[PDB]
Amino acid sequence: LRLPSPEVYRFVVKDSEENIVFEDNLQSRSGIPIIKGGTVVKLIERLTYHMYADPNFVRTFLTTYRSFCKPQELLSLLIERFEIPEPEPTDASADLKRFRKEYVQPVQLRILNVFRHWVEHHFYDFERDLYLLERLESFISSVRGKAMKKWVESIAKIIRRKKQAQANITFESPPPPIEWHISKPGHIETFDLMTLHPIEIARQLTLLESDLYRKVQPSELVGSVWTKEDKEINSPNLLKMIRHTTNLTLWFEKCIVEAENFEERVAVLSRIIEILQVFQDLNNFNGVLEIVSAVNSVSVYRLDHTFEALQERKRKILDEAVELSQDHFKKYLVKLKSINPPCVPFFGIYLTNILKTEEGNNDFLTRHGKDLINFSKRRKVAEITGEIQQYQNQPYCLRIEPDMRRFFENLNPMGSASEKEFTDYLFNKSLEIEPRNPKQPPRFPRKSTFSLKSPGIRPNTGR
Numbered sequence: 001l002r003l004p005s006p007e008v009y010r011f012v013v014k015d016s017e018e019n020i021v022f023e024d025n026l027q028s029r030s031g032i033p034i035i036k037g038g039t040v041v042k043l044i045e046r047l048t049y050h051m052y053a054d055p056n057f058v059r060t061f062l063t064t065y066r067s068f069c070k071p072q073e074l075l076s077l078l079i080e081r082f083e084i085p086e087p088e089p090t091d092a093s094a095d096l097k098r099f100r101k102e103y104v105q106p107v108q109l110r111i112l113n114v115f116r117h118w119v120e121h122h123f124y125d126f127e128r129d130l131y132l133l134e135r136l137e138s139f140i141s142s143v144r145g146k147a148m149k150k151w152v153e154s155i156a157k158i159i160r161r162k163k164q165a166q167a168n169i170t171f172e173s174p175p176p177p178i179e180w181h182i183s184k185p186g187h188i189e190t191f192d193l194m195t196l197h198p199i200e201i202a203r204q205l206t207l208l209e210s211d212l213y214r215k216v217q218p219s220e221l222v223g224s225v226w227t228k229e230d231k232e233i234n235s236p237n238l239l240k241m242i243r244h245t246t247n248l249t250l251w252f253e254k255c256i257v258e259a260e261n262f263e264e265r266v267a268v269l270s271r272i273i274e275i276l277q278v279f280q281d282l283n284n285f286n287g288v289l290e291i292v293s294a295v296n297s298v299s300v301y302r303l304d305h306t307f308e309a310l311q312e313r314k315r316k317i318l319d320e321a322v323e324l325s326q327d328h329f330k331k332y333l334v335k336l337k338s339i340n341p342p343c344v345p346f347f348g349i350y351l352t353n354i355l356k357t358e359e360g361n362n363d364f365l366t367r368h369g370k371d372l373i374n375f376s377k378r379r380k381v382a383e384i385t386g387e388i389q390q391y392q393n394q395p396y397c398l399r400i401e402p403d404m405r406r407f408f409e410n411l412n413p414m415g416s417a418s419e420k421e422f423t424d425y426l427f428n429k430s431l432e433i434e435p436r437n438p439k440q441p442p443r444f445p446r447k448s449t450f451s452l453k454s455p456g457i458r459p460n461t462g463r
């Protein structure tokens with residue numbers, strides 16, 4: 001009772017459809033009102049509401065806010081919220097005592113709770129922006145409220161821990177012995193699709209893809225930020241994962257189309273299908289669907305002579321993989337739900353589903369007279385991004401082979417060419433090795449001398 005004037009404290013402007021919109025349904029009957037949208041001011045007010053705690057909103061807000069508000073602006077808004085002016089006196093004590101107990105203290109504790117969640121669950125904002133951390137530490141160090149003391153200490157201890165974990169691998173059971181074929185350790189120059197063991201290609205790619213996947217934060221996906229001007233800052237782990245997928249997909253395509261000799265090309269496709277089967281055995285659906293993407297590419301898809309020459313069992317394994325992707329990944333989604341982790345989900349489908357949600361819902365409930373942020377849109381994207389988290393907790397029981405890891409981290413099939421110049425190259429080479437005519441395929445010689453014979457995908461050294 002008795003708040004500062006809206007003139008001196010922007011939060012306490014009267015709630016209206018000008019500034020805040022709530023769900024009006026059977027769910028929003030009782031409990032905390034559900035926010036559909038608002039001005040950033042009203043979202044901040046509701047994030048730090050005097051009348052009740054809202055942990056669900058705090059969690060969703062700190063996952064999604066970068067799609068409507070910069071980290072620097074969030075910190076400025078929370079400090080603005082904290083600095084509450086005293087109401088205009090009636091004439092000439094008691095009122096101030098209530099205001100401090102019922103309004104100021106609860107709002108200030110709610111802000112310090114937001115700070116605690118922010119540093120606990122989204123410290124990457126501060127790792128990315130040292131000035132943001134300087135502002136935060138300066139502010140929290142200025143807070144002198146007697147009730148604030150345990151909160152400031154809590155925040156300070158989280159920051160100490162977070163900093164210490166940017167300075168400072170452990171098997172729960174024996175991992176399998178590393179498989180070798182023609183290529184030998186420390187002979188990274190001899191490393192090739194066909195000289196490495198297909199088992200160990202699949203294992204080392206799985207460890208690499210698992211590591212990339214486990215580093216992607218939900219906030220790298222919200223607001224389609226990976227396709228926008230601040231993508232390198234908002235989505236650095238997701239961009240690494242996408243660049244990995246592009247490079248590995250184009251590498252598979254390159255290995256096939258550059259195999260000018262028919263027998264070598266069939267052996268290369270056969271070996272990629274063996275790698276696909278080990279990815280399947282490892283629940284690396286990311287790897288499975290990268291090979292599916294390579295085989296459906298325009299330059300490989302048209303190599304009917306090469307596909308028709310496969311062993312029927314290899315063709316069967318490939319057809320079943322290709323089918324996982326058909327009808328909006330219906331069979332993929334069934335398979336993903338049925339498996340025991342560890343697993344590497346196909347990341348492409350989360351991107352597609354977020355792009356569809358981002359393109360299909362307005363960022364704003366309206367920009368006429370105010371920026372009214374569509375929060376319900378962000379709640380929907382956070383439900384999708386939330387699915388990514390359930391498979392980031394279980395590491396693989398596989399030993400890293402550091403030369404193979406370096407080999408796969410440094411795949412550059414495009415060389416110094418554009419992706420478009422590279423894919424035009426692959427298509428023109430595809431037309432050369434299997435022309436658009438009804439004649440038997442051209443007979444080119446092999447340029448490589450390695451045996452085409454697969455060691456197969458039953459562990460040998462495993463023994």
Ligand SMILES: C[C@H](NCCc1ccc(O)cc1)[C@H](O)c1ccc(O)cc1
Nearest residue numbers: 295296301302303304307308318319322
């Ligand atoms: C069917 C694939 N060739 C299609 C040929 C074509 C070329 C150009 C077009 O515009 C349309 C079709 C391939 O052999 C294959 C791919 C995946 C498999 O699991 C099995 C086979």
